[PDB]
């Protein structure tokens, strides 16, 4: 064959089962208002990325506190969830993972981080500023609104030295 036949690919979102339910229909647009979300897919992605980290914990919690699988994978999961800032340090229990919401995931977007430090007046102005290559992460210019910023790399978010706003 060609080599490209061996490349992997995957879908990264799940659509809901009943589309026309009113309460989640307007709950789904309050989310599009508090964050500059383009379309419903960016919500779906989020829920999909939750549904996996929720499946892992519930698998380990069925196990025993002294098994090696718990000792290994739960530690890996917690160490990964603390660096992204999706979960905070004071909750270092595997049972603290289950009560997580999507908003915790959305709060570590670059669009959200720059709003918090007030580099942008709102979230829409923030999205526009992201597209204009006006913001750098650790001296590296990042163009992606959906970028996920680690707690190590959140001290170091600025306007790019090369810029028309410098």
């Amino acid at each position: 064959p060609r080599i490209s036949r061996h490349r992997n690919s995957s879908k990264t979102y799940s659509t809901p089962k009943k589309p026309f339910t009113k309460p989640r229909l307007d709950a789904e647009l309050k989310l599009c208002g508090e964050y500059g979300l383009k379309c419903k897919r960016e919500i779906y992605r989020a829920r999909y990325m939750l549904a996996k980290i929720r499946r892992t914990a519930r698998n380990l919690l069925t196990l025993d506190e002294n098994d090696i699988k718990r000792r290994f994978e739960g530690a890996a999961l917690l160490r990964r969830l603390h660096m992204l800032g999706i979960l905070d340090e004071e909750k270092d229990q595997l049972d603290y993972v289950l009560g997580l919401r999507i908003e915790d995931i959305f709060k570590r977007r670059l669009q959200s981080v720059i709003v918090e430090s007030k580099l942008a007046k709102s979230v829409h102005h923030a999205r526009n500023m992201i597209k204009a290559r006006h913001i750098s992460v650790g001296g590296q210019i990042v163009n992606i609104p959906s970028y996920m910023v680690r707690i190590s790399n959140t001290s170091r978010v600025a306007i790019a030295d090369t810029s028309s706003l410098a």
Binding site: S136, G139, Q140, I141, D161, T162
Partner: protein, 90 residues
């Protein structure tokens, strides 16, 4: 441009050469060429290849083959890199 550094230097007395990785730093500006920074890395025994620029600019990574003789370069260098430097042109 003003900043040129090298690492991963391996001496190869089988192929009569030394192999290197080169990092080029040019914050804000371009670095104009490989033929330019060839001075910082004689000159005619340096073979520069595989240069990529990162997103946003400012950084470049490439590879250096530095020979000691001149027959060595006409012997151990691919026949299209000797035409990219104008050394043969056929």
């Amino acid at each position: 441009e003003i900043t040129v550094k090298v690492r991963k230097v391996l001496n190869n007395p089988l192929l009569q050469r030394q192999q290197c990785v080169v990092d080029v730093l040019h914050p804000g500006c371009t670095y104009e060429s490989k033929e330019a920074i060839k001075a910082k890395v004689d000159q005619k025994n340096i073979v520069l290849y595989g240069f990529k620029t990162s997103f946003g600019g400012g950084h470049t990574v490439g590879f250096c083959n530095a020979y000691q003789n001149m027959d060595a370069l006409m012997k151990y260098e691919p026949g299209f890199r000797k035409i990219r430097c104008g050394l043969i042109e056929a």
